[PDB]
Write a protein that binds this ligand. Structure first.
Ligand SMILES: *P(=O)(O)OCC(C)(C)[C@@H](O)C(=O)NCCC(=O)NCCS
Ligand SMILES: [Mg+2]
Lengths: 129, 217, 98, 69, 115, 87
């Protein structure tokens, strides 16, 4: 049966450079599991993404809908969305700047959110300078 | 005695039987899901299952601003400002995906429609998402909030100053001049109030609705 | 007074200095002419008052989360020149600088 | 000045302790990620901003908004 | 509904969107056979004197009942390849994107709030 | 179960992890040293060393005493409490 345990095994089989699995609560209405992995090259990312989808198709039920590999044309970021799981395949330098790990663990307390300041309307609706 | 707006039909040539059929269906849905008494002024929290997610539960809190539609298709729009962004969602009462409807604060505003909140200051449209419900005593008339909201500059979504809207919940003195007042008053239509063939008497109708409701119970 | 050349120092800076000197002097004079409630050291406030009274202002649309807001952007260059013109004329009154 | 100079430490200690009971996520990465965060971003700053970092780390410790598994 | 020459609010962390400019970003083109653009519809902007692709995430025009309606027309800047320009989205994002046909996983990943 | 253990053996395994560490090298590493001063290790750094001792012997280290676990002759003495060797 296709599960999270099956997913992590497949990535390790394909020699994923780094594996991160985060179990987001049902309060955040996206997924059961958010998975971010690192790849050595674009070709390596493609290989991993295609293999897991091929393995999924074999193991999936007939009622289970087909999945789409997203960001094929992109050389740095690939993502596959399943029913209960989201897989992100990205290059190490891409992962560092986006820091998706930080965002999902800390929803409103992320460092990059802190630097963002909300826009302010000037009082009396009159601009200055 | 409070009757839900959707139960009372709009006037027309529709066969009464159609209303009977729709009413019984509404009443079965009400048996499953409790729909509390609420007004347009009232603050509500709607719990819903979303088809886009895998049966995840969504809570949305906001002030009701419009109750419209009749029968099973009846809806209500509730508005809230979430992290700087003003969002309205239009909820169908008898949609089976609606898990729970909770009245956090039960109140009436001066106006039956609160669409002018779109053009009012954001503060009036902003409500705490995690506010605790306030309970009313079993025997008391529903409170009326006599709040007049301050407005943004003149270009508005609708011309609220015009008498057709009949808005009684805006500080028009602050944001408008007497010249603008008289300009608006040119659209008065004083006769319209006294036109007594335009009146829709929902007395006998409501009585028949109540008979059917008590029969269902 | 405009005796010296105006290339040295700009127009917007004129209003600030004139406000400071007039603050020390008869500040009750100019506030009544421009309809300002109370004399302030802020150059922005007084330039808004003259712009409003002249009626030379432009409404601009800024897109916000609660919807687009029609904020007013005053014509500060125009207001500054008018303020200087008023001072030079006897409309403002008789005030010595030095 | 954080709430306490031992608070930051006890926060760092507990997070490292959690790192050992990881099953799916690479242990080395977990330790490296905490190391790079607790040092680069959390070494030299002001007392006013120090408390903010601690609360952030704390929301991470309990992991009510998500836990690394 | 976003058409050609519609002023637009960029809801993104991107430098291009947030930087001050004399004119608001304006829709050059809508990547749909009818000119009308809705949530999840890719558009082309004139922003800061350059042509840039964007994705619509909520608009003023009412849609289906349970779907949210936003007070401002909201876009997220995307490169030609498809990856987002900005790192974070502070503004709440509708959940209807997930089921919609296209590359929405990147945007949902970088989003923080859902309404 | 109960493997053969001595105080000398305790020292050997303690210095084994220290040389394995990236920051501190065997060249300047000694049996008598200070982490704070001699080895120039920070307070956060020291936590990692404590955890190496945590997993190796499989007994919990409280946070109250973890502060004073410095100067490695103290570490060997601290862990000498478990399975005391008189020598
Ligand atoms: P240790 O005592 O050698 O290191 C010093 C210290 C980093 C623990 C601390 O005293 C300090 O200088 N700053 C407090 C920590 C900080 O910068 N932010 C708090 C993050 S939770
Ligand atoms: Mg309109």
């Amino acid at each position: 049966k296709f599960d999270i345990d099956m997913m992590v095994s497949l990535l390790r089989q394909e020699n994923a450079r780094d594996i991160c699995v985060i179990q987001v609560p049902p309060e955040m209405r996206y997924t059961d599991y958010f998975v971010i992995v690192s790849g050595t090259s674009t070709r390596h990312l493609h290989a991993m993404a295609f293999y897991v989808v091929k393995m999924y198709k074999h193991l999936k039920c007939k009622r289970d809908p087909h999945v789409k590999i997203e960001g094929k044309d992109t050389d740095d970021w690939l993502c596959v969305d399943f029913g209960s799981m989201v897989i992100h395949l990205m290059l190490p330098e891409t992962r560092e700047i986006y820091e998706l790990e930080k965002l999902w663990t800390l929803r409103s307390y992320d460092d990059q959110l802190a630097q963002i300041a909300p826009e302010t309307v000037p009082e009396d609706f009159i601009l200055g300078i | 005695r409070f009757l839900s707006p959707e139960f009372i039909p709009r006037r027309g040539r529709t066969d009464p039987l159609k209303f009977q059929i729709e009413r019984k269906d509404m009443l079965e849905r009400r048996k499953v899901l409790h729909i509390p008494e609420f007004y347009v002024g009232s603050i509500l929290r709607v719990t819903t299952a979303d088809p886009y997610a895998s049966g995840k539960i969504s809570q949305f809190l906001g002030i009701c601003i419009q109750r419209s539609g009749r029968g099973l298709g009846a809806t209500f729009i509730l508005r809230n400002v979430i992290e700087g962004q003003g969002v309205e969602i239009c909820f169908e009462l008898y949609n089976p995906r609606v898990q729970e409807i909770q009245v956090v604060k039960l109140e009436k505003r001066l106006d039956d429609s609160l669409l002018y909140l779109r053009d009012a200051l954001p503060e009036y449209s902003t409500f705490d998402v995690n506010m605790k419900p306030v309970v009313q005593e079993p025997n008391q008339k529903v409170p009326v909030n006599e709040l007049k909201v301050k407005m943004k500059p003149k270009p508005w979504s609708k011309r609220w100053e015009r008498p057709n809207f009949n808005i009684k919940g805006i500080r028009f003195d602050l944001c408008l001049t007497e010249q603008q007042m008289k300009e608006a008053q040119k659209w008065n239509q004083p006769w319209l109030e006294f036109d007594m063939m335009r009146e829709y008497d929902t007395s006998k109708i409501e009585a028949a609705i109540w008979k059917e409701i008590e029969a269902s119970k | 007074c405009g005796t010296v050349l105006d290339h040295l120092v700009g127009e917007e800076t004129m209003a600030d200095y004139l406000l400071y000197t007039l603050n020390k002097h008869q500040r009750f004079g100019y506030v009544q002419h421009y309809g300002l409630g109370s004399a302030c050291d802020n150059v922005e406030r007084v330039l808004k008052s003259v712009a409003v009274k002249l009626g030379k202002t432009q409404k601009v649309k800024v897109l916000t989360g609660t919807g687009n807001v029609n904020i007013i952007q005053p014509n500060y260059p125009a207001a500054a020149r008018d303020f200087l013109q008023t001072f030079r004329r006897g409309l403002l009154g008789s005030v010595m600088l030095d | 000045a954080p709430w306490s100079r031992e608070a930051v430490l006890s926060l760092y200690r507990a997070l490292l302790r959690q790192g050992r009971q990881l099953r799916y996520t690479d242990r080395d990465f977990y330790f490296a990620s905490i190391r790079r965060e607790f040092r680069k971003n959390q070494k030299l700053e002001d007392a006013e901003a120090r408390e903010r970092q601690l609360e952030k780390g704390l929301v991470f410790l309990n992991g009510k908004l998500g836990r690394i598994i | 509904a976003i058409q050609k020459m519609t002023r637009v609010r960029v809801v993104d962390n991107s430098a291009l969107g947030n930087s001050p400019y004399h004119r608001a970003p304006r829709c050059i083109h809508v990547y749909k056979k009818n000119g009308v653009g809705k949530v999840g519809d890719q558009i082309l902007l004139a922003i800061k004197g350059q042509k840039k692709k964007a994705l619509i995430v909520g608009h003023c025009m009412p849609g289906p009942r349970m779907t949210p309606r936003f007070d401002s027309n909201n876009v997220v800047l995307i490169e030609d390849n498809g990856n987002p320009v900005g790192t974070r989205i502070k503004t709440p994002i509708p959940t209807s994107l997930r089921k919609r046909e296209g590359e929405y996983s990147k945007v949902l990943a970088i989003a923080q709030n859902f309404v | 179960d109960m493997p053969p253990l001595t105080l000398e053996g305790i020292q050997d395994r303690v210095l084994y992890v220290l040389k394995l560490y990236d920051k501190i090298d065997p060249e300047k590493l000694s049996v008598n040293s200070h982490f704070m001063k001699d080895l120039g290790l920070d307070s956060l750094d020291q936590v990692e060393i404590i955890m190496a001792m945590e997993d190796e012997f499989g007994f919990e280290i409280p946070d109250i005493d973890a502060e004073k676990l410095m100067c490695p002759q103290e570490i060997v003495d601290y862990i000498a409490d478990k399975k005391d060797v008189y020598e």
